[PDB]
Amino acid sequence: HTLVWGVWVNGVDQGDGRNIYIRSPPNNNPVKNLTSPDMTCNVDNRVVPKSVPVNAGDTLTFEWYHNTRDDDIIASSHHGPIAVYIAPAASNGQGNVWVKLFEDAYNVTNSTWAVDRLITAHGQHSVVVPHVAPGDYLFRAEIIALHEADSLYSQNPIRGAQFYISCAQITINSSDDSTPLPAGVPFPGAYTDSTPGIQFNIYTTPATSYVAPPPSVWSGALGGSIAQVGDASLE
Template sequence: MLVLLLKVATVFGFFASPVLTHGIVTGIVANGVYTQGWSLDFYYDIVNGESYATTPGWYEDALDSGFIPPSEYQDPNIICHKDGRNANISATVAAGSTVEFQWTNPWAHNIGPMLTYVANCNGDCKTSSASCRREKYDTDECKQIDKSTLEFVKIDESGINFTTQEWAAGVMIANNASWTSTVPESLAPGHYVFRHETIACHGASTLGGAQNYPFCLNIDVTGSGTENPTGTLGVDLYKETDPGIYFNPYVTLTNYTIPGPALWTG
């Protein structure tokens, strides 16, 4: 009964609050196969010691489905969202094919870029037990990846169409709240963390006003690629004064610097 009440309170709290436009990556389609992402229901399952669904979506504590502010760009929360911890399974995708990321729908933050990164785990990305509970996350049974050591390589980015002034986030919304990224064909096979993100910039004219929504998923890459590009630590991806983070989005833009390191195309 307590579990049910917690979940009901979460649902009603979500729809009664002003954060209606916030959300998460609810699922992915890789190699034509749909896999559910993280769900807030799983958080309460874990807290209450219940089993929860296997998912490649990383655990996170953002109960309001909220964002990471620029003031936390050098905090581990920016890596895979608030208290992000690795998932209990991995999805699979072939290098050269696509991953479709499905966001909470509807999504209303239509000003901002879309970005996708990958980080090689140099070993298995998932927990050592699919039955891990939150209170056991630091045990050998639930061995965690040290996310602070993951080096992220940007494989996809999109900012603004200067002709139409439409942002990538607006394209995502128009595409049924989904975004598709292509995995470079030359990327070496292995176990990867995919970090997919939108940065809502409707408040970017104020320092610290941007809103980052990063989400991580375990995805194994197959294929015959040989490239292992050098990446960037999550806490070094952005600074709050970056020109693509702190700017006036309410003028006609003729240039825009997409945040983060340079795009790697393979």
């Protein structure tokens, strides 16, 4: 169980964003139903009042918490990958609009899942804002926890892959638009019971074998990290 508190821009904390620039759900409960509209931006998907300003090139940092800011972040059992997508806010998540900007499953060297490292990075991970058409966007951060993913939720509703999904409202101001945004995949829709990465047994299968659900990272993506950029206790 985990939620997003706010975002940083170029290492500058933008302040508490809950129900403000984040479309926050009432709680940190997982989404599990792959066909639910809840797969779009979780269970309380609606325009919230503000939208964070950025430029192409900027480093946008998501910040997750479990119960309170800079706490244990998310329970260690919840091993899994992490993705970020983007879409035009016009679409409100609907249609085939979602383009992936980032992916991190398992790191062979360090021998840690993305989530493992997110605990260590005080709940912070980042992407570099791409050169798309200025305007309003949604950035969808997605944690998949696989602690019960040896079953499918459709066949057993008290197990299955767990999605922790958070949509941030981001306004891109300065960009030259050298890589305009493509069409994307829909959510719900893009993940099924048969998609790879959705059913997987982390107790028997070695993490090295894990393949994250498609789609692939779009070519116009600029990376890419899971690491603390800010100190929240300093404020």
